[PDB]
Every structure is written in C-alpha cells, then in structure tokens.
C-alpha cells in the first residue's frame, strides 16, 4: 500500500546585515519554519498545493550562502544554534542589540565565519504547539508524531537562532531553507 510520501521543499530568503561604526556589536535573529510559507507564491489555480492530510518534518537543512568574495576587508565570527523549544534570546524593538554574544555558551553552538563563507546546519526541529505543557522527552528517534495539515493554519517549527557579527560595512547573505517533509493520507477529491 501507500504509507509514506517524502518531499523536499525549499525556499530562499535574503538576509541583510547593517553596518556598525566600530562597536563590534552583534545582530541576533531567529528562524521558524512553517509549511504554508514553502509553496511558490502566486500559483493559486487549485486551493491545495499539498494534497495530503498528515505531515511531519524530518530534517531541516539551513544553508547560509554568502554574497561577498573572500577578499573582503573585514571578517567576523558569529554563532548559530539549533533551538528546539522557541526560547530565543532575540532582542525586542529598540533594544539596541547586545555588544556581547548571547549565543556563545549554548550546547550546539556552531561558528559561522561571516561574510564570505558557507555555513550549513542540518537537524531535526520540534513544533511550537504551545499546549505541550512543557515536557521535552529527549530524542524519540526523529519526532515520530504526525500533524494535521491545515492550509494556512499550520504550526511553526523552531529552528536556528543565529547571531552574526556586524562589521564596518553592511553586507548580505542568501539563506536557503530545506525541509525533508514526510506525508500521509492523500485526500484528493
């Protein structure tokens, strides 16, 4: 019969890092993945671009791809972490983002060598359901738990919190999210 249907969805987001007048201040932001933002925008001839009902995200692969060449006049050394519970340390509005690194002492701290070097994280995310009561239950062999696919009402899955060092000149990354989704119960009319 028809048990599992793999898919590999991909989106690309530009990521601007503004300049800084030699304060060596960081710029922190967080990433969440939700399945309704990975469809190509505009293509709305049929209302169900994903015609299944039950889905789960197996792996997320986040690629920080650069734009500047390797002979940039200034390097910088930030850190990315996989956050699996949505407790980011991201600043508020007008918080004046910290001079000291907030993502420096975490458990899965990978180092990203900004602004001219590729950086790949490949992990398993967890949902942000907000009714999970708080219990973690450490790794259950890649989150074997199916979720009902609702077109436009999907939950978010918490992923990378990156903290990249602002430099003397502003620069640009191209970030590429890939989700290795599994699907079940094809329900076309």
Cα 99 to Cα 26: distance, rounded to the nearest angstrom: 6
Q: Is 40 in the site for a copy of itself (CB under 8 A)?
A: yes
Cα 148 to Cα 37: distance, rounded to the nearest angstrom: 16
Residue entry with tokens 């599992």:
4
In the complex, minimum distance from the CB of residue 105 to a copy of itself, in angstroms, rounded to a whole number: 5
Q: Which two tokens stand for residue 162?
A: 């990156």
- Residues touching a copy of itself, count (CB under 8 A): 62
Who's near 66: CB < 8 A, 6+ residues apart?
114, 115, 116, 117, 118, 173, 174
Q: Of residues 16, 21, 23, 73, which one binds a copy of itself by CB under 8 A?
A: 73
Q: Of residues 16, 21, 23, 69, which one binds a copy of itself by CB under 8 A?
A: 69
Judge residue 150's burial from the number of C-beta atoms within 10 Å of its C-beta, 0-12 exposed, 13-18 middle, 19 or more buried.
exposed
Q: Is 47 in the site for a copy of itself (CB under 8 A)?
A: yes
Q: Is 6 in the site for a copy of itself (CB under 8 A)?
A: yes
> Which residues sit at the interface with a copy of itself, rule CB under 8 A?
1-2, 4-12, 14, 24, 39-41, 43, 45-51, 54, 65-77, 100-101, 104-105, 109, 129, 131-138, 145-148, 150, 174, 176, 186, 188-189
């Amino acid at each position: 019969k028809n048990g599992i249907t793999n898919l590999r969805l991909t989106r690309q987001v530009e990521l601007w890092v503004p300049k800084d007048a030699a304060n060596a201040s960081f710029y922190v932001n967080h990433y969440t993945f939700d399945l309704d933002d990975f469809i190509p925008a505009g293509t709305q001839l049929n209302s169900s671009p994903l015609p299944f009902k039950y889905y789960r995200i197996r792996k997320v692969k986040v690629e920080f791809q650069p734009r500047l060449p390797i002979t940039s006049p200034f390097r910088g050394y930030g850190s990315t972490v996989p956050i699996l519970d949505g407790a980011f340390v991201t600043p508020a509005t007008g918080e004046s983002d910290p001079i000291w690194d907030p993502y420096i002492n975490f458990s899965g701290r990978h180092v990203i060598r900004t602004p001219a070097w590729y950086h790949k994280r490949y992990f398993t995310p967890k949902p942000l359901i907000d009714g999970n009561t708080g219990f973690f239950q450490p790794n259950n062999k890649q989150n074997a738990l199916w979720f009902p696919n609702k077109q436009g009402q999907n939950i978010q899955w918490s992923g990378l919190g990156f903290a990249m060092q602002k430099g003397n000149e502003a620069y640009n990354y191209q970030v590429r999210f890939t989700l290795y989704v599994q699907f079940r119960e094809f329900d076309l009319f």
